[PDB]
Design a protein around this ligand. Structure first.
Ligand SMILES: *[C@@H]1O[C@H](CO)[C@@H](O[C@@H]2O[C@H](CO)[C@@H](O)[C@H](O)[C@H]2NC(C)=O)[C@H](O)[C@H]1NC(C)=O
Ligand SMILES: *[C@@H]1O[C@H](CO)[C@@H](O[C@@H]2O[C@H](CO)[C@@H](O)[C@H](O)[C@H]2NC(C)=O)[C@H](O)[C@H]1NC(C)=O
Ligand SMILES: *[C@@H]1O[C@H](CO)[C@@H](O[C@@H]2O[C@H](CO)[C@@H](O)[C@H](O)[C@H]2NC(C)=O)[C@H](O)[C@H]1NC(C)=O
Ligand SMILES: *[C@@H]1O[C@H](CO)[C@@H](O[C@@H]2O[C@H](CO)[C@@H](O)[C@H](O)[C@H]2NC(C)=O)[C@H](O)[C@H]1NC(C)=O
Ligand SMILES: O=[N+]([O-])c1ccc(O)cc1
Ligand SMILES: O=[N+]([O-])c1ccc(O)cc1
Ligand SMILES: O=[N+]([O-])c1ccc(O)cc1
Ligand SMILES: O=[N+]([O-])c1ccc(O)cc1
Ligand SMILES: O=[N+]([O-])c1ccc(O)cc1
Ligand SMILES: O=[N+]([O-])c1ccc(O)cc1
Ligand SMILES: [Ca+2]
Ligand SMILES: [Ca+2]
Ligand code: NA
Ligand code: NA
Ligand SMILES: [Zn+2]
Ligand SMILES: [Zn+2]
Ligand SMILES: [Zn+2]
Ligand SMILES: [Zn+2]
Ligand SMILES: [Zn+2]
Ligand SMILES: [Zn+2]
Lengths: 481, 481
């Protein structure tokens, strides 16, 4: 459908004149960031952003592509080069090292320079690289990690952990030789490496000994504690800190976030990853936006400021399943969390970056009409006289042959939350993609986010803006009020 | 392969410190642009840029992803929203209207507001929108159109034409009713609508009457003149301008570009589109870079400045064939042309923008090792135990079944210049994609290119920077020396 207002060139000329006016008003801050926030859309590449924009636009009864996402409103954009040192198409662990520690790493390691080697515990020591979050804590800021995945998953683990193997969630995962060599599982590192004021997301099971019933699924043994070392890491964490609280559901999270006596908060809301937003039990589980707000309630108390990591962690997972419906609905909630954080913080003193760790082989094609559903069929048949979808994957589990041929697809089928878009190459999981991802920035020193940069730039600009090591001589004035 | 220097965190910290230093040195100009250049990579989306970067990096005996393209060096980046008014995934005609005229249009029209309708001649008048190039000419600047496609193709036609049908290359293409209604073919518009100082690219055949042997292929009738109205548009164009020259080969182009008496130059080097760079006869045909330099030789003579359109027009065509080798080699030549123009002009007085009209359903995935060929196989087999490539398409003519199954692929096969990467959906031509594309900018007012913008912003910022209508009250100082 052609929106009538857009048929008039004045519509476009007025918009562009407004855009030019806004562009001219942008001025660099001479002042430091008090607070730092990184919003990480796991797998949220450029095709994901545009597709999610269209879906969100239509969610609010618009045509789609013309309505800005909250992230679209950020004044400064750069492209981020995501390659790992050893692989062109990266993973979440080693990208986390880049955007959180400022150093590129090898595929599937976390918080380590590329002198380390995947799954080789004895290459760990000397190669630890300290995150901006760690440095923020050292400078007396409060720090928070918020994600829809396990809090021990690769991305949040980049804020605190150093490991040659992202798969080492608990001691149960670590081979005997590595345990002997002192490579700690990620759950242990979470509570041991540094003080973290707010930890919210999934990953209950890795904190408790085998045999410990999950409080939410006490009748499902597979959801229970995983630990073989008898440790209760939650009790250990609580024992270290006066004013610490542990919660596992939304109601207790709410109570904790408003409780003045709570100085440290760990909320682990599922045994593993949190449910997709479309599957979330809104009585039992907080959304990413709600967790973001809860984190901000506590972190904002510190007069020295805070560093906050917020991850739309299951965007990635949706794409891996080649279920664009899941990827894009996760992306919208991620954008909602960005929007919410923007309402609760000031760009006068808070540097916010939105980025992705890497992309996916997700494409948005065919020649669909303005206003058509992103989950719809491309107009016109394929060469095999069957329909095809506007959303497709290069590879992944949506590749199908029924009776020796590519299957036809209907609108009702293509629009289902369980539908897997077709791909060229069958894989159990669709792959990451290696093309550049966007970095969006707002706040003090955000104007430094520009051009095409190595992904490591994200960590460095954040440390610089807050005058953290190695940029204590930042020569910036104190944060603005 | 893991490059040893990158194993040291100091490598990444030094690079980022340098990047921060460079970012801090950026300052906005208070002065206007004397010259304007738009480099348009047709179909050159973010996945194309990254893949081309890797290929070019390796061309210069590097590992790939770490080596900047010339476009990567531009300080200012924005994302450009490419939707047409009527379709989410756009074509070249209506995107051309956006980035060259500053107004969005309907799919397959050129230089017209979205009040016009495709292939409806009687909806043309009143809906013409004037290009920045036209306005530059009106302001006394010299103007040039350079492309590897037909000069009557959708993208260059956006600089000068207004038509409800991009397919109307010559009068032979225009239906009787539209001819009667005065909708002129694009070849006629090229010579009639405005004075253009330099016109270089393909499209000889549309300028000459049926029966006219092509000078380069005098024995191939299909390459001969197409016109049914008896007009020789080249003679007509020459007759209008003292100091005008027409050339059809590289040798004459060279002579013309150095000839002080040549004020107007039309070089039409193939009957239709120019050959792919990998097929170019370097005695008979200039490369895009060579055409760019030839245009700059003449355009730079005008003390008032110039507007130059330079198109990597066959990037798009490579992707349509699902032959990434062609798409990416075209992209590298496009980047070479950008680099060359940067050597021949000053960023003190020249605003250069590099962008794409839209993207393609091209993806770069699997988990290939650092330094591996972009045309290689992904490590590890697909679920069907056969190999697959790191480059894939969502749809297009690379979809194959041999004996009822997806074919295996070898490195020798995947690396061939004729190889079509596999897709999910068979189509005679792979489709454009609708995700945002990059805009790179350098020069006076380039800092205004920021954030996420409608594609129309590209035209507007260019007009503004040069103080052209509608921005004659730009309030900028005269261009810098
Ligand atoms: C990490 O430990 C591994 C495993 O013991 C070491 O690999 C051995 O190295 C020796 C000498 O090069 C070889 O002869 C063995 O075959 C290797 N063993 C295995 C099982 O791979 C490795 O040298 C250690 N690395 C460091 C940095 O100490
Ligand atoms: C959220 O978690 C809290 C804390 O564990 C749960 O509160 C317990 O509820 C059980 C069953 O009603 C009671 O026996 C205990 O008195 C409560 N413990 C505490 C420390 O308050 C609460 O049930 C959970 N909410 C939901 C919906 O499951
Ligand atoms: C452009 O010309 C077309 C073709 O003549 C016009 O379409 C006709 O419109 C009348 C009245 O609405 C219909 O009854 C006919 O069936 C149409 N003819 C065809 C062949 O489509 C159209 O109205 C014209 N548009 C303008 C702006 O004048
Ligand atoms: C490039 O074009 C020029 C101009 O048309 C060609 O020059 C002509 O060559 C023919 C054949 O040798 C001569 O009969 C004419 O004297 C030339 N015409 C002019 C006006 O110079 C030239 O041959 C072309 N080059 C190539 C390699 O084909
Ligand atoms: O970390 N990752 O995304 C991975 C891990 C293993 C693998 O085979 C491919 C990708
Ligand atoms: O022994 N276990 O792992 C158990 C025991 C009881 C229960 O409700 C859940 C798990
Ligand atoms: O815990 N929190 O801060 C919350 C919880 C729920 C909600 O809707 C908003 C904020
Ligand atoms: O202009 N285009 O890119 C087109 C034209 C026709 C079509 O069916 C699809 C795409
Ligand atoms: O009549 N024709 O179209 C012709 C005639 C002669 C020739 O060499 C080429 C084309
Ligand atoms: O015509 N030109 O300006 C040229 C032609 C060829 C070349 O290699 C460089 C410039
Ligand atoms: Ca739960
Ligand atoms: Ca030729
Ligand atoms: Na393992
Ligand atoms: Na036609
Ligand atoms: Zn990831
Ligand atoms: Zn993640
Ligand atoms: Zn992933
Ligand atoms: Zn195009
Ligand atoms: Zn084009
Ligand atoms: Zn195209």
């Amino acid at each position: 459908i052609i929106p009538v207002e857009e048929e008039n060139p004045d519509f476009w000329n007025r918009e562009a004149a407004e855009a030019l006016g806004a562009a001219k008003k942008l001025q660099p801050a001479q002042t430091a960031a008090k607070n730092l926030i990184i919003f990480l859309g796991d797998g949220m590449g450029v095709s994901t952003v545009t597709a999610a924009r269209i879906l969100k636009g239509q969610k609010k009864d618009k045509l789609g592509p013309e309505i800005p996402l909250a992230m679209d409103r950020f004044p400064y954009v750069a492209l981020s080069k995501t390659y790992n040192v050893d692989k062109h198409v990266p993973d979440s662990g080693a990208t986390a090292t880049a955007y959180l520690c400022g150093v590129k790493g090898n595929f599937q390691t976390i918080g380590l320079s590329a002198a380390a080697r995947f799954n080789q515990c004895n290459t760990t020591r000397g190669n630890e690289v300290i995150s901006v979050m760690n440095r923020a804590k050292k400078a007396g800021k409060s720090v928070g990690v918020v994600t829809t995945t396990r809090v021990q998953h690769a991305s949040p683990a980049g804020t605190y952990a150093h490991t040659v193997n992202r798969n080492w969630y608990s001691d149960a995962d670590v081979p005997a030789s590595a345990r002997q060599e002192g490579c700690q599982d990620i759950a242990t590192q979470l509570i041991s490496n540094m003080d973290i004021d707010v930890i919210l997301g999934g990953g209950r099971k890795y904190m408790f000994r085998m045999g410990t019933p999950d409080p939410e699924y006490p009748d499902d043994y597979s959801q229970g504690g995983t630990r073989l070392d008898g440790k209760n890491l939650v009790q250990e964490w609580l024992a270290k800190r006066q004013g610490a609280r542990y919660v596992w559901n939304r109601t207790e999270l709410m109570q904790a976030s408003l409780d003045p006596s709570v100085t440290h908060l760990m909320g682990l809301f599922e045994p593993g990853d949190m449910k997709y937003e479309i599957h979330r039990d809104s009585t039992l589980d907080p959304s990413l936006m709600e967790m973001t707000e809860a984190a901000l309630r506590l972190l904002s108390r510190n007069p020295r400021g805070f560093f906050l990591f917020v991850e739309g962690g299951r965007i990635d997972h949706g794409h891996h399943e080649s279920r664009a419906y899941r990827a894009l609905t996760e992306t919208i909630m991620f954008d909602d969390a960005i929007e919410r954080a923007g309402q609760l913080t000031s760009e006068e003193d808070t540097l916010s970056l939105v980025t992705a760790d890497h992309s996916h082989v997700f494409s948005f094609g065919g020649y669909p009409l303005r206003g058509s559903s992103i989950f719809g069929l491309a107009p016109g048949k394929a060469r095999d006289r069957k329909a095809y979808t506007v959303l497709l994957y290069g590879n992944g589990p949506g590749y199908v042959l029924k009776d020796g041929a590519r299957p036809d697809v209907t609108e009702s089928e293509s629009g289902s939350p369980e539908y897997r878009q077709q791909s060229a190459v069958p894989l159990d999981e669709e792959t990451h993609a290696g093309e550049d991802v966007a970095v969006f920035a707002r706040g003090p020193q955000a104007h430094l986010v520009h051009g095409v940069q190595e992904q490591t730039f994200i960590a460095h600009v954040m440390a610089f803006a807050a005058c953290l090591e190695p940029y204590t001589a930042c020569d910036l004035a104190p944060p603005a009020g």
